[PDB]
Design a binder for this molecule. Structure first.
Ligand SMILES: [Mg+2]
Ligand SMILES: [Mg+2]
Ligand SMILES: [Mg+2]
Ligand SMILES: [Mg+2]
Ligand SMILES: [Mg+2]
Ligand SMILES: [Mg+2]
Lengths: 448, 448, 160
């Protein structure tokens, strides 16, 4: 199989310049007693064709047995095409490149680290129809570098009845921009969509009228049945009426699958599509050697047409993540970026928003922004908002002030002296305050 | 959190008898320095509610720190419901029970091993609309214990042009029952659906007319776009016309997600739904400690409404599988069965077919059947068919003869003396023949 | 969609990709399917972009089901021989919303792996906002070509 499904003398530069292959880089470990090349070649065979057939064979063009790396070239013609409109489909990419090869007996483990999409394949993906600039426009902020969008999830995340949920939304929106459903909250019997959603809209209107600022809501429309998704979407837009453009659609894209993402993307392209990656950890965890990484997941989501996707807090919060995850944001938001193995040109395809969630607060944000290089993000900070000693609204304000502080290159301690909400965040998260800003109590004139 | 989200004094017997909870059993290992109970309780919180809210809290009711087991009770009301028809959705089960808890920083690993579905929740799942008895009926075999259905995938699995693919189908159907697309083959530019599918139908008709026996075809309709799936399905049924009931729809359900499975199940319930689990190995592998097992996947598929699902060869072929996997078949095909942790009553819900693929042949089947206890399966044997020294048709016949041999409790060597195709399978797979039936050459009068 | 999407297909810079050469097949109405397709092929050997004349659709002497598959053959042949991508703008103008969608669906199905290269031409002035929005909202991923035939009745310099 090595003779047919491997050509380690191929130059990657030529494969890229040719534009006739999707390239994929894996970590791979063969089973006991199995040679590295024969394993790689077998993976290539099982991931493609198993005289014309030879022209569409997947080819191993590189292996590094010492580092446990293998790279495969997949001819473009392998991938499935819609009969309806000729576009390619991500499910075909998954089926071929990370399908059956995950259950091979002669392979100990196999995980995708990166992939390269050539010009023609890129032209045939949907790509995003909306992005963060559309939200900036609504919020009356610059459509270029409009900056930080403050947000949250209502707490508790599940269990609130319609009236309580809507009141909490109103209270937050008095200070913040963006609210979203928790990933599992939809039409539970204790909080039916037909009851809560009209109440949420009342809160949005009330907050808009009182603050004179636009507000945003991201609704979960995740469902097994395509027509259930469309039923929820249709009802949401009708309910929000003249503000319906401010409704984003949240889809649990990892557990829900490409079918659900595309339903939102293709049936409601004019609504910001919010990809929630709940479940992703089962393969993207640092301890995992199977499936694919968070980087790969995020890059795929852009092709699928997500307007934004969760990328974590990059080591500045909780969960499993690190500072190097900033490359994930770069790949989905830039027009030209280099991944772990492949440089990618996006040729004007719209950027997918990096959405930050999981343990951030006003005190941690300056460091996060410094690492990232910007604040063009949506931050749904649950703890950062409700954790504020004064109010969820004050928490939202403190988050925004933290961005304005970093953007101005100002001293956080001195910035606090002229921004009450930000200052009160020090007292809201004293353990973080002591670590990040030792001596803050003395400088801010706060109790010991 | 332990105080609120754990009650280790609850009796599982009561939780089951109550019928108010979905129960879930996990393997779990906490991160370094994290207590086992606090980890379990934290998982329960993150997997549910994060005075009314307390009534829908998920509860840890059992832990075994030594064995690394934890069991959680999820109140039924937590799970999302369709606004359209009130049915529950598997994506909600995934979101809550195996979503965010896969990315928790204080958890080293967490994998679902089993779950219990109470009567009311079971009543609200779609369940299968078709099963193997529908295929037996078509084939003119007993709708009860109709037995072995011989099948294959055309080789090579991708790359054949329309005319070559259709000819191979005709040749196999002269001896076998069932043909299916390879998981990635659909509408590639080198074998367009509009070209190949009418040719495949001609082969089916020709084979039916010449053998006087009905034939079956399982077509891949997997696609990102719901309406692409429906376009492929509609065209397939129109093409097969008076034989359209013999068309099964193959869906790559693991990589495709619940959305695609339900599209087939709900829009084409009268067509046998074939769940292909390509990609599943990324979490179901024995080496994996994340996500969920093959057993869990299979049990879920029945609720989703799969008519059949791949379950592997249970250690009698290649890939990762063992003899104990027979419990997977039992859980999806029986009305009453005990999983690794929970006994399940199905209350008349239709059975999902265990579909066998990956390294079987006529010589290995007797042992497989003996382990399983029956042959009520679909076996898409690629190697077992095309590996036959005479022809793919002869291979299909040898597979059927192997089942008839086992069913009759006959001696395989003696059975071969009166069944040429079966006998020729010994010469087709000599290495298997030597292991399973030493001395066969002398007894069958075959060359040394 | 905008010109950058066309530049991308043509392999030109998505910023300032420059001039896109095109034409209308002559005569504008009256050619049978095979003659029309032959003319399209001949132009595409040198040019990028072909559009239907504004009234050209499903006349009995040149039915869509006949000519469109022949035009796609011409596009494929020209692409294969030149190694360059080609573009076709099809008139889907019609009174009936569902007639528009029928033509659009058939066009995309016909062009298959090249369906992204089909633009939809709409006689927007005479057809009105309804027809423009039908193309825009039901087929947003297809380049929308607004033909302003008739506009002169109010836009003329002599008009007040
Ligand atoms: Mg959440
Ligand atoms: Mg890894
Ligand atoms: Mg296969
Ligand atoms: Mg395990
Ligand atoms: Mg003209
Ligand atoms: Mg004038």
């Amino acid at each position: 199989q090595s003779n047919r499904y491997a050509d380690l003398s191929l130059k990657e530069e030529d494969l890229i310049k040719g534009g006739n292959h999707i390239l994929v880089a894996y970590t791979m470990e063969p089973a006991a007693g199995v040679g590295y090349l024969e394993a790689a070649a077998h993976i290539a065979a099982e991931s493609s064709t198993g005289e014309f057939t030879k022209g569409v064979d997947a080819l191993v063009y590189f292996i590094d047995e010492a580092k446990g790396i293998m790279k495969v070239a997949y001819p473009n013609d392998l991938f499935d095409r819609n009969v309806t409109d000729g576009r390619v489909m991500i499910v075909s990419f998954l089926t071929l490149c990370i399908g059956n090869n995950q259950g091979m007996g002669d392979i100990a483990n196999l995980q995708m680290q990166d992939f390269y999409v050539p010009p023609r394949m890129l032209q045939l993906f949907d790509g995003p129809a909306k992005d963060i600039s559309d939200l900036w426009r609504i919020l009356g902020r610059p459509v270029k570098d409009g900056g930080y969008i403050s947000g949250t999830i209502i707490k508790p995340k599940l269990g609130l009845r319609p009236e309580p949920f809507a009141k909490a939304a109103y209270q937050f929106w008095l200070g913040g921009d963006f609210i979203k459903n928790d990933e599992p909250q939809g039409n539970q019997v204790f909080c039916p969509i037909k009851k809560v959603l009209p109440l949420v809209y009342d809160s949005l209107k009330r907050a808009q009228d009182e603050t004179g600022q636009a507000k945003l809501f991201s609704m979960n429309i995740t469902a097994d049945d395509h027509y259930e998704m469309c039923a929820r979407a249709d009802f949401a837009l009708e309910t929000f009426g003249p503000d319906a453009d401010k409704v984003a659609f949240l889809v649990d894209g990892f557990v829900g699958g490409p079918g659900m993402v595309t339903t939102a993307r293709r049936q409601y392209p004019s609504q910001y599509l919010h990809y929630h990656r709940a479940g992703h950890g089962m393969v993207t965890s640092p301890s995992s050697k199977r499936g694919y990484t968070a980087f790969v997941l995020a890059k795929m989501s852009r092709l699928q047409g997500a307007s934004g996707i969760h990328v974590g807090t990059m080591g500045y919060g909780k969960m499993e993540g690190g500072k190097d995850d900033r490359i994930i944001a770069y790949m989905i938001e830039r027009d030209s970026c280099t991944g772990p193995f492949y440089h990618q040109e996006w040729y004007g395809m719209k950027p997918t928003t990096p959405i930050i969630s999981g343990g951030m607060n006003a005190l941690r944000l300056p460091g996060f922004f410094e690492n990232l290089g910007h604040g063009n993000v949506i931050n749904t900070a649950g703890g950062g908002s409700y954790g504020h000693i004064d109010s969820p609204a004050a928490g939202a304000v403190s988050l925004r002030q933290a961005y304005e502080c970093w953007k101005a290159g100002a001293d956080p301690i001195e910035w606090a002296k002229e921004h009450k909400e930000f200052a009160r965040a020090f007292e809201s998260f004293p353990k973080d305050a002591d670590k990040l800003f030792p001596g803050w109590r003395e400088k801010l004139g706060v109790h010991k």
